[PDB]
Amino acid sequence: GTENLYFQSMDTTSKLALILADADLPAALKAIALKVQNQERITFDEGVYLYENAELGYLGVLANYIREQKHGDNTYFNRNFHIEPTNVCVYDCKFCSYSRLIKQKEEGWEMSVDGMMEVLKKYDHEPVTEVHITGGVVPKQNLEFYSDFFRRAKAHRPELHIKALTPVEYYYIFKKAKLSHYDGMKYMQEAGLDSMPGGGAEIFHPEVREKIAHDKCNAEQWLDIHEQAHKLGMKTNATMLYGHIEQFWHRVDHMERLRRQQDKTGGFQAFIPLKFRNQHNQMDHVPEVSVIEDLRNYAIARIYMDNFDHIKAYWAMISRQTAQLSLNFGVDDIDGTLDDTTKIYSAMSTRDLVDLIKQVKRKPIERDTLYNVVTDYSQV
Template sequence: MKSTENLRFLLNYERLTQELKQIADKVLAEERITFDDAVYLYEHAELGYLGVLANFIREKRHGDVTYFNRNFHIEPTNVCVYDCKFCSYSRLIKERAEGWEMDVDGMMDIVKKYDQEPVTEVHITGGVVPKQNLEFYATFFKRCKTHRPDLHIKGLTPVEYYYIFKKAKISHYDGMKYLQSCGLDSMPGGGAEIFHPEVREKIAHDKCTAEQWLDIHEQAHKLGMNTNATMLYGHIEAYWHRVDHMQRLRDLQDKTGGFQTFIPLKFRNKDNQMHYVAEVSVVEDLRNYAISRIFLDNFPHIKAYWAMISRNTAQMALSFGVDDIDGTLDDTTKIYSMAGAEEQNPAMSTRELVELIKHVGRHPIERDTLYHVVTDYKEVVFEDENPKKQYYSLPVVN
């Protein structure tokens, strides 16, 4: 593979420090890098070096394959009891006039809108309000599964679950088990932000702690659920805070094996209480994806949300460790655009997404939530928006 040749060439590059050569040796030998190694990469490694290492790992695991899925989002409310300083999306309880709060019927109306569409997943997350409690979501999950049993429900984050379970006076395990029995299939990775209390206390002091976030994921893993994990980067954190965050995720993954995908989330400074913090560059975005891929050796997938970072940056990220660029989405997804994402209308047709991937020499695969192949688009010729041929033979590495 060309990525192996590039890595071997890199090892002979005279300008590399001894530390960078040692880290590259570990990557070539498929050995785990340390906490200190990762901090050193953030502080000293150039973009090209990181791209070679991350792409080597990416292609070793997934070749040229790039995954996406056909999904839609439901955001039950943007009203929230929490006051996260970085959030451009939510409105505090006292600001209800500027927000929305759906009932179960309203959420089901969105589900029914996609009855004739070949979507495989509904992604549910939003603010936290008292009336959207345990039974509210239990009712919705049951109705959603009764209406469309094949639709995978990826619902809520530990921030929402912690509040819901505490209010219901139920343990994390029992709460997750109950909602799983109602139809919940998996959990997205939001609400992680930065785990270290030095940062978390400043940007999200009143939401669940890192330990509580991790425990809810652990209980989900015990129940056989797969989940994702995120990290909000590029604000007031230091590099070592990022590594501390990923270390905690890597440790839990060693224990449970339940995480599927890691998703770095870029801080956006539009219309929030941290508007004075400058956003990091695209170069820093790519460096962060690459180091994530190198450090999180036990995470199968690294995802870039194209709607948050732009289509062009997502294409570049596919050479810096990323193998998944999320889904087709639709224009109901307000979290991205309200935060100042470059994609103000976060919708892309399947054809557009496939062509975006192919234009950078990658192999597009439509997946379901659990990374089973739905359609292999490598040689598909489009007529309107429907593929002429489908392939199911490609093995998926999890």
Template structure:
């Protein structure tokens, strides 16, 4: 992190999940509190919400037994929040969990948020059954996806934002989600890493320009806002006028006989 900030001090460093931090701190034999303070002093500015999966042990031990426990995941985020820093949270849904497992997951996040207020965004992640050991599990329907977003918005009213990745759920479903509690559908991207394709995303080769994303949001009568990592407004595109694409010029050439 220190090298990154030295090379590009203008960049916001949001990196690694509690799964990695737990392993690093265990190897270094330091506490979560000391470890997160060291990370912050080295240039870390926020942490993503990955690795949460489903918190309840009867599911977690089946789908993520090699990852840190729910209590460890939450403890690392709490130590980070205690430093005055922000993070996100996720939930992988639509596989072998029951509805009450989702409620249990959100309740644990809600309780931590009540204590610290450090979470920015809750991100429900739709399980995809391609290229994994649960390929026999049917995926959730679009109707269930939308209900899940809506329940997340109602239950986690102490979270400022609910996010859906348009590339994972499709552009059309992302538009619908904006009417079901979602206020962030991610940004422009070029999937050069192929991570979305490997994860079985709805869009196998996702890519969208700023203008396309703005138009997608305006089609459902929402205000498109470009933001930074901490949700500060960068550009309000409500009345923004994009320059017309430059059309190629063609010239008449003399006919030579």
């Protein structure tokens, strides 16, 4: 009664070896395990096969093998802050609480360029490396507005990296400006855009996208705007909204499109699964998937996305425990709101995040825009 304890005790390489020598493991799971040992790409039908057949333990062996081969114990997080230009939107995403169908313009606010600069200036004494800019799409927040803001932010703090806006936003403002995607992203980069976050991906396949995100930019337009960014030397992230009404093959379709794009242009850094949460949206009725399904999803993302450096977990949207366990199922990269401020006159701190990473035996690296170390907290 120590067979399972023996398995759990094995290093990463030997766990993979043990699974390959198990006579009772189905031939198809072995063949995928051998592909991972040989650094061979997993095909679409193999991806769907993992989702529909592979257990958590098996997926851990393969995902953690790939994660440790690429990163060892390195677990990355950056020091950034968020500006939300508006919390109302012209689109109707069924999963989103900003949908024009459940939130009128009057419940909401709209920042001016002055307002965004006043928020940015509050961080002037923080060693933040990056600002994340995202929110609703509204017609007053146009190409002119965002180019004006990028120029002011770059003149005020030239070394602050601007990770601003998704293809959902760029499709809208380029179409209104009458700019091609290439010319628009070129213009925005000159004004001071540095990279795009991975938002607005949802699920790409029309069968799902028509039902959860009908009106905003489609898969073709999302991938095309990332292509133009990559051709201009910009790095970008990619997301996938999972655990709602999609089938497993929709997730593999989504990752397959991302993987081909990455083969063409190579500018993706991180793939960020986003777990559907059924609070405060028109998908209220839709049941959330289990923690086991979240961990299997990170694992298959690590296995499938062989040309993406980083699998990233957004800590805000999941339990502490799921975030921590994800670091053993393919995740090397963490996004959170780091908040180290002392409340003078009466939130995840760096110390709390460093402790969560060390608790599951990982090396917490605070990283810069190039994913190089600012502080290696394993030596602190």
